Design a protein around this ligand. Structure first.
Ligand SMILES: CCCCCCCCCCCCCCCCCC(=O)OC[C@H](COP(=O)([O-])OCC(O)COP(=O)([O-])OC[C@@H](COC(=O)CCCCCCCCCCCCCCCCC)OC(=O)CCCCCCCCCCCCCCCCC)OC(=O)CCCCCCCCCCCCCCCCC
Ligand SMILES: CCCCCCCCCCCCCCCCCC(=O)OC[C@H](COP(=O)([O-])OCC(O)COP(=O)([O-])OC[C@@H](COC(=O)CCCCCCCCCCCCCCCCC)OC(=O)CCCCCCCCCCCCCCCCC)OC(=O)CCCCCCCCCCCCCCCCC
Ligand SMILES: CCCCCCCCCCCCCCCCCC(=O)OC[C@H](COP(=O)([O-])OCC[N+](C)(C)C)OC(=O)CCCCCCCCCCCCCCCCC
Ligand SMILES: CCCCCCCCCCCCCCCCCC(=O)OC[C@H](COP(=O)(O)OCCN)OC(=O)CCCCCCCCCCCCCCCCC
Ligand SMILES: CCCCCCCCCCCCCCCCCC(=O)OC[C@H](COP(=O)(O)OCCN)OC(=O)CCCCCCCCCCCCCCCCC
Ligand SMILES: CCCCCCCCCCCCCCCCCC(=O)OC[C@H](COP(=O)(O)OCCN)OC(=O)CCCCCCCCCCCCCCCCC
Ligand SMILES: CCCCCCCCCCCCCCCCCC(=O)OC[C@H](COP(=O)(O)OCCN)OC(=O)CCCCCCCCCCCCCCCCC
Ligand SMILES: Nc1ncnc2c1ncn2[C@@H]1O[C@H](COP(=O)(O)O)[C@@H](O)[C@H]1O
Lengths: 49, 55, 347, 120, 320, 97, 40, 167, 98
């Protein structure tokens, strides 16, 4: 060891890292799904297909 | 005379002294609730009778 | 304070402001203000010392007086209109009384005299609530009654707030009074553009809330309530001096920063309406605000004041304070000017 | 100004007519700037907590970038919608009030007399 | 953090763990009272956690690798140079006293954090309530100035008000002649330079100022040099105390929650030790401050937050 | 009108009896503040406002919106009870319980 | 020849009750550090 | 004279306000506000507001001014007051004299000087008091109003117990 | 307009100028504040009864209740002020000038 007291951030909070990566991946797939649905609705309403 | 005194006196120094003096007049309040509400009453009387902000 | 009781009381502050924002009846506006004042009194008396009791008493007296003037304006509106809809008022006397009452609740000059006292008397988190969240409900009422707001009254209040808030902060060394006079000047800027374009009122309100929340969060993160204790920050946390530097330069409205965004748009809306003298003198008067912001940047970031020996102990301990949204708020308070046309989302 | 326009259908962040508009591209430079602001927030978050700035918490930096891009995409959609509404109202008002917007007779500079001011 | 408002809401009350043995006991005495074993003896009879007396390098023992830092990074002051040159020009005397007050403040915060998080009582040696009896004993000897006493009283006025006093204060009566006999038997060549008037001033501010003011807010036990040798009599006296004074009686879960929130935030504990009072004994100018800060950051394990230092072998930093 | 006459008569009789009692025997020659009392007065005031909310109930039972009326009546008496329970458990009703 | 940094004399100008002490605001002392006044 | 009874009670109402607002002592100020509350109740009763007038007696005078006089008795135990009182009295009776000699006045608003019986309705309400029915509709129509008022009173209990504790 | 409204508004302005001109006591200020409330109650009540506006008959009660709760809060502040200085004098509340 090095430290005389075990630090709070000596080991990674794996629950919080998992929630972070899962939330970020969810927001990316929801953003890409929203964007594809929006370009499809734009092309449907304006007749560009 | 000019570029250490008078051109220094007329634009920056007199402006700075004026803002200092206005700052000390605005912030010389005695912390009394009585005087602030008396100023609020004088504000309402000037707004109604002297400025006609209610018409 | 019990944390559950703190959560219920903060939700009640929020509920009072939300009731003001969502209601169509004047009695529910007045109820939202009463609920908000009643719930925010314990937040000011959180630490139980005579300065907090004095600040809460002064706050109670000013907000209760404004609440009675508000109810008299509502009652005169009911005389001359027979109804209670939160819309334009149907009497100029009721319009004057409601504008006075809302200016007292905002602490706009010449009803500004409680804001530095009450802000100084209370902790930094409760002064954060007072200078940001407590502006939201009266500005929303001013938003809805602007077809009946007298122009000369609201512009007199605006320029008087900008000048008095500029000169008031020049004499201050306490950080809470600096933020209070800065608040008075920024509310003057918000009401000056209100009858011309209330979207710019909302823009100035949002940018002010972001920058003021940033400065209060930095002050809480460094435990500093004076200029001279803020000057120790370089020897303890040198990143915090850079953050207070960029945020104070932004609050001065210096481009390319985000606090240049409101006043520019405000001038952009006041010259379309052929008012040229007024935004000119307003912008020149805001140089007073920039002067005492620059005073704080000189003492904190651009020079190194002398420290003490016991500071060496605080080098061995990290900041365990939850600096909630401080990097996000610091980025939004400084780097937002390239996204200036985002303001149309407030329309 | 446009507050009675969005008052028959209140509290809609993006109304249904906003779907007639092309959405911002994901390579929108405004959206790339908002992602850059998320990256700067992640760096300041490492800096104020005395973490190594570029290296520590890459999951946290990526959630900063992702959350700013996510919020900013919808903010840009609403921005473009409101300027489209502004122009739609402008053009419909000009089309419905021709007496207020006459077609001005454009004159060529052979008829236009301008006063000459010599620089001498 | 580990403890906060959420853990208090989700059931963690400190009166569940506040048993009868959860007592903060401070042992006091003069420079060679021999209290240092007595305290340990009490902590091995009542089952309490013993904290040794906070010196210059207490904060060094609580942070980093636990090893003492070089004296320019912690202290900037010497006890031995105080013993050699008490009236020195560089201001070692009050700088040493102010650093020791900050160290005892940190130690009292550690003791209250252990007591309020575990329910185990703590035996201290010369807490922040008894630190001032050196200060006045320096000021009565002309070792420090009146301005140094004013600075000390400002820092004490805004720091000690936030804490609870100990439950038991144990004092050890040892006369100045026996103190000097034990100093000469100790053999420390610096500590043998202590005058008689300084030790007599320590005893006078002990008996005339400290013990009268701690007799109201807690329970003072006072022993001579020979009756403090029997630890069983001292522990018998502690176990048969009827606690009826001081502000420990009116401590519910809310007040002790607020106190535990205070004593786990060490920068908030150490906030007002560095107040901007520009006293020449404690003021460090900006060039020395900058230079010693940047030398402190280059120490191993000290550049970043504790879990974030590759040079001392911290892993998974890109996921922290 | 009869009520104003009756109030005037009761006030006149009371003032006449007080004037007799203060001037018929003239013929012959011959604190530290207590927080507890203030708290019980404020608790009276707050529960008295809650009672003022409860006073139109004999008229409110005549409505055709009885499910809503019964819900709001029970909710007001319940919030008076929650005020009492908070006053109880936070030691507000102590030493004058 | 090194860079000037503020001395104690420069820094004491920012520790007063106000920034510009006049005749009226000369009895003003700065507030307490923890903002707690004694109960008198 | 009896056709002006609401006006006479309103004169006594303003006289009571000049009484306590000149602030002789908070106990005499409490007495002046009590007398004012009684005569304002009488005004409300003469416009047919029986329940609202009895709320002035039960809640304002019997509930709130009791607590004011109580706190005043626990806390307490001139020339400006008398001059202010005669000033407000002379201003009020100059208002009376003008609006009686002219049957019209304009201080800020225009005011008729006839007896205020003239504005009333000339019908009946059948077998109910309309004011009683509108107050009874707080439970049927005023659901959100009941919610926000009861929540504010519960919060008021909590707030008084927070700020009076000192801890 | 009708003649009683003149006096109820004048009562409001008299109690307003009483509340905007303090003498010494905080209690006298709270009495002027509740006089302002009483006049608002009476004026609201006379309008609502004159108009036969039925649903607004519950409005002055609400105006009473909230404001008396407000008054309760004010009394508590006064008491805490009176637990600091011995009196409720407004001139003792001047620490926040600096
Ligand atoms: C729309 C408006 C949104 C406004 C902001 C709302 C959230 C913030 C306010 C409340 C708050 O403080 O929450 C905590 C807050 C973190 O604030 P903090 O304590 O200051 O951050 C320090 C570290 O991040 C804390 O690090 P840690 O080690 O304790 O944990 C790592 C943490 C772990 O994360 C999690 O645990 C998340 C997973 C669980 C989520 C909940 C699941 C149920 O990672 C993060 O939170 C990464 C930072 C995320 C970004 C923060 C700012 C969000 C974007 C704000 C809008 C930007 C707009 C720019 C526009 C510019 C042009 C106008 O947020 C989260 O923890 C989750 C953020 C999720 C963002 C979603 C965005 C889209 C929503 C639709
Ligand atoms: C980026 C800009 C924001 C950076 C924020 C964090 C900066 C930081 O901490 O850097 C430290 C870090 C190095 O530090 P370190 O050794 O790891 O640890 C800290 C040291 O121990 C530090 O040692 P120390 O703290 O012990 O003592 C030295 C002391 C030194 O400080 C002092 O002694 C006091 C101050 C000295 C005088 C003041 C100088 C001016 C500072 C303010 C700037 C004003 C001008 C800005 C614009 C004008 C308007 C105000 O303090 C520091 O140096 C603290 C670090 C901060 C330095 C830089 C501050 C930047 C933040 C503020 C500016 C940017 C945001 C606002 C912008 C406003 C509008 C543009 O620097 C970097 O890593 C810089 C970034 C390099 C890589 C950039 C890669 C870019 C990739 C972009 C693409 C990927 C994203 C794609 C997104 C789109 C997706 C669709
Ligand atoms: C906590 C909330 C408790 C009360 C919930 C509603 C009770 C009820 O009967 O509501 C019906 C009542 C009345 O419904 P209703 O069915 O009588 O309405 C029919 C129309 N009239 C009145 C003409 C007969 O209220 C509503 O529906 C709307 C008002 C309340 C909405 C809910 C607010 C909750 C806010 C919580 C924060
Ligand atoms: C051509 C342009 C003319 C105007 C230029 C602006 C004013 C001059 C330049 C800025 C002020 C210069 C300065 O340093 O003034 C110092 C003076 C006292 O400040 P002090 O805190 O004592 O100084 C630091 C310690 N030596 O500071 C003061 O007295 C206060 C200065 C306030 C300046 C505000 C300027 C506002 C302009 C708009 C007014 C409306
Ligand atoms: C059209 C507009 C409609 C409305 C839009 C939204 C408006 C938002 C207004 C924001 C006002 C926020 C006020 C602060 C939060 C309220 C509660 C509070 O103060 O919590 C802080 C809390 C208290 O900690 P405490 O323990 O009391 O501190 C004493 C020392 N231990 O903890 C702390 O002190 C921790 C320190 C950090 C706290 C930072 C909080 C930042 C919140 C504001 C973010 C920026 C504003 C939102 C974005 C823009 C919206 C306009
Ligand atoms: C941060 C973004 C969070 C957005 C969540 C959804 C909010 C929403 O749907 O708001 C609707 C509102 C438009 O509603 P509208 O009735 O037009 O508002 C008039 C107000 N003057 O939409 C908006 O007001 C959107 C703009 C709000 C931006 C606030 C922070 C900058
Ligand atoms: C202009 C707007 C007001 C117009 C009416 C003026 C009424 C007469 C009062 C004038 C001022 C007299 C005075 O001494 O005011 C100060 C006094 C409080 O000061 P105090 O400490 O009691 O006395 C020491 C002297 N300053 O102040 C008071 O006690 C004033 C109390 C006012 C109560 C209003 C009574 C009715 C007034 C007429 C109708 C309006
Ligand atoms: N002003 C002071 N003068 C001398 N010793 C001090 C002073 N302040 C604290 N001490 C400590 O008190 C110790 C003497 O007690 P002891 O631990 O029994 O030797 C010294 O070794 C120092 O660590």
């Amino acid at each position: 060891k090095f430290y005389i007291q075990e630090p709070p951030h000596g080991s990674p909070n794996w629950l919080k890292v998992g929630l972070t990566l899962g939330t970020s991946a969810f927001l990316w797939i929801y953003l890409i799904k929203q964007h594809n649905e929006d370009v499809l609705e734009y092309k449907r309403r304006n007749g560009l297909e | 005379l000019l570029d250490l005194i008078w051109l220094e006196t007329i634009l920056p120094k007199t402006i700075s002294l004026a803002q200092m003096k206005m700052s000390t007049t605005i912030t010389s309040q005695k912390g009394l609730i009585k005087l602030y509400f008396l100023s609020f009453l004088i504000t309402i009387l000037i707004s109604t009778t002297l400025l006609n902000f209610h018409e | 304070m019990n944390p559950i009781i703190l959560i219920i009381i903060l939700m009640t502050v929020m509920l009072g402001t939300i009731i003001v924002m969502i209601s169509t009846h004047w009695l529910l506006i007045w109820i939202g203000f009463e609920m908000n004042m009643l719930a925010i009194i314990p937040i000011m008396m959180k630490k139980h010392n005579p300065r907090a009791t004095e600040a809460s008493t002064k706050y109670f007296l000013t907000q209760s007086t404004a609440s009675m003037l508000l109810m008299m304006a509502i009652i005169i509106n009911l005389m001359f209109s027979g109804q209670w809809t939160v819309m334009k008022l149907f009497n100029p006397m009721a319009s004057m009384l409601m504008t006075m009452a809302l200016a007292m609740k905002l602490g706009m000059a010449p009803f500004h005299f409680w804001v530095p006292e009450v802000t100084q008397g209370i902790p930094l988190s409760s002064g954060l609530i007072l200078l940001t969240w407590q502006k939201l409900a009266p500005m929303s009422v001013l938003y809805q009654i602007l077809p009946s707001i007298n122009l000369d009254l609201i512009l007199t209040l605006s320029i008087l707030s900008i000048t008095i808030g500029g000169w008031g902060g020049l004499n201050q060394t306490q950080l809470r009074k600096i933020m209070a006079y800065s608040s008075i000047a920024h509310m003057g800027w918000m009401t000056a553009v209100l009858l011309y374009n209330p979207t710019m009122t909302l823009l100035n309100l949002i940018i002010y809330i972001i920058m003021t929340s940033t400065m209060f969060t930095l002050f809480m993160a460094n435990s500093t309530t004076t200029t001279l204790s803020l000057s120790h920050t370089w020897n303890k946390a040198p990143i915090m001096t850079i953050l207070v530097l960029i945020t104070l330069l932004s609050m001065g409205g210096l481009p390319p920063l985000s606090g240049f965004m409101p006043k520019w748009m405000i001038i952009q809306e006041m010259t379309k309406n052929d008012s040229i003298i007024l935004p000119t003198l307003m912008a020149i008067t805001a140089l007073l605000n920039l002067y005492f912001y620059m005073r704080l940047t000189y003492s904190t970031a651009l020079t190194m004041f002398p420290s003490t020996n016991n500071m060496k102990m605080k080098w061995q301990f990290p900041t365990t304070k939850r600096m909630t949204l401080l990097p996000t708020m610091t980025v939004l308070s400084t780097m937002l000017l390239p996204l200036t046309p985002i303001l149309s989302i407030l329309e | 100004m446009m507050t009675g326009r969005q008052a028959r259908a209140p509290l809609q962040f993006l109304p249904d007519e906003a779907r007639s508009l092309p959405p911002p591209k994901l390579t929108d430079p405004r959206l790339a700037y908002i992602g850059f602001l998320g990256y700067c927030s992640g760096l300041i978050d490492n800096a104020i907590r005395r973490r190594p700035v570029l290296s520590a918490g890459l999951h946290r930096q990526f959630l900063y970038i992702t959350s700013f891009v996510f919020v900013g995409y919808y903010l840009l959609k609403r921005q473009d919608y409101m300027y489209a509404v502004r122009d739609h109202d402008m053009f419909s008002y000009i089309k419905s009030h021709p007496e207020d917007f006459p077609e001005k007779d454009k004159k060529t500079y052979r008829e236009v007399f301008e006063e000459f001011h010599p620089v001498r | 953090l580990q403890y906060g408002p959420l853990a208090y809401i989700l059931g963690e009350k400190t009166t569940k763990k506040m048993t009868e043995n959860s007592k903060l006991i401070t042992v006091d005495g003069n420079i060679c009272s021999g209290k240092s074993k007595l305290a340990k003896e009490v902590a091995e009879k009542l089952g309490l956690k013993h904290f040794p007396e906070a010196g210059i390098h207490y904060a060094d023992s609580t942070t980093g690798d636990g090893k003492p830092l070089p004296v320019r990074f912690s202290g900037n002051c010497s006890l031995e140079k105080f013993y050699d040159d008490p009236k020195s020009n560089d201001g070692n005397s009050y700088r040493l006293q102010a650093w020791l007050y900050a160290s005892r403040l940190l130690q009292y915060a550690d003791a209250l954090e252990h007591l309020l998080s575990t329910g185990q009582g703590v035996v201290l040696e010369r807490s922040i309530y008894s630190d001032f009896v050196f200060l006045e004993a320096m000021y009565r000897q002309g070792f420090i100035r009146k301005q140094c006493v004013d600075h000390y009283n400002q820092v004490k006025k805004v720091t000690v008000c936030e804490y609870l006093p100990p439950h038991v204060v144990i004092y050890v009566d040892v006369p100045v002649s026996e103190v000097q006999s034990r100093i000469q038997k100790k053999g420390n060549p610096h500590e043998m330079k202590i005058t008689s008037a300084y030790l007599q001033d320590i005893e006078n501010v002990y008996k005339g100022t400290f013990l009268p003011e701690m007799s109201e807010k807690c329970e003072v036990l006072q022993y001579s040099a020979w009756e403090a040798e029997d630890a069983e009599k001292v522990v018998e006296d502690i176990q048969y105390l009827k606690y009826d004074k001081g502000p420990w009686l009116d401590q519910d879960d809310r007040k002790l929650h607020n106190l535990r929130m205070l004593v786990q935030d060490k920068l908030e504990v150490l906030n007002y030790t560095s107040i901007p009072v520009f006293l020449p004994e404690v003021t460090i100018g900006a060039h020395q401050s900058d230079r010693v800060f940047q030398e402190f950051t280059e120490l191993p394990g000290r550049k970043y937050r504790a879990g974030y230092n590759e040079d001392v072998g911290d892993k998974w930093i890109w996921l922290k | 009108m009869n009520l104003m006459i009756t109030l005037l008569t009761n006030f006149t009789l009371a003032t006449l009896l007080v004037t007799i009692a203060f001037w018929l025997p003239q013929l012959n020659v011959y604190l530290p503040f207590s927080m507890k009392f203030f708290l019980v007065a404020i608790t009276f005031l707050l529960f008295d406002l809650e009672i003022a909310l409860l006073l139109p109930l004999p008229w409110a039972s005549q409505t055709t919106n009885l499910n809503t009326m019964l819900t709001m009546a029970l909710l007001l008496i319940f919030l008076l009870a929650v005020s009492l329970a908070y006053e109880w458990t936070q030691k507000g009703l102590e030493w004058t319980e | 020849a090194r860079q000037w940094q503020p001395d104690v004399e420069w820094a004491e100008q920012y520790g007063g009750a106000v920034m510009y002490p006049t005749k009226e605001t000369a009895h003003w002392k700065p507030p307490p550090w923890n903002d707690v006044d004694p109960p008198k | 004279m009896m056709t002006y009874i609401v006006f006479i009670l309103s004169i006594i109402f303003v006289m009571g306000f000049v009484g306590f607002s000149s602030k002789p002592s908070p106990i005499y100020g409490g007495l002046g506000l009590i007398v004012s509350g009684g005569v304002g109740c009488g005004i409300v009763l003469n416009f047919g507001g029986s329940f609202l007038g009895l709320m002035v007696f039960l809640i304002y005078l019997g509930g709130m001014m009791v607590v004011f006089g109580y706190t005043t008795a626990m806390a307490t135990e001139n020339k400006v007051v008398l001059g202010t009182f005669i000033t407000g009295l002379l201003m009020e009776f100059l208002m009376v004299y003008y609006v009686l000699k002219d049957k019209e006045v304009e201080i800020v608003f225009k005011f008729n000087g006839m007896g205020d019986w003239v504005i009333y309705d000339t019908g009946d309400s059948g077998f109910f008091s309309e004011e009683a029915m509108g107050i009874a509709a707080l439970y049927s129509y005023g659901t959100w109003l009941v919610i926000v008022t009861g929540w504010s009173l519960l919060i008021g209990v909590v707030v008084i117990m927070e700020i009076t504790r000192g801890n | 307009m009708s003649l009683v409204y003149m006096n109820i508004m004048m009562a409001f302005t008299v109690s307003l100028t009483g509340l905007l001109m303090y003498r010494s006591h905080l209690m006298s200020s709270l009495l002027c504040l509740e006089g302002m409330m009483l006049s608002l109650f009476i004026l609201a009540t006379l309008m609502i009864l004159n108009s036969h506006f039925t649903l607004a008959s519950m409005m002055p009660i609400i105006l009473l209740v909230f404001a008396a709760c407000e008054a309760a809060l004010g009394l508590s502040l006064l008491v805490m002020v009176s637990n600091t200085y011995g009196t409720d004098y407004v001139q003792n509340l001047n620490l926040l000038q600096c």
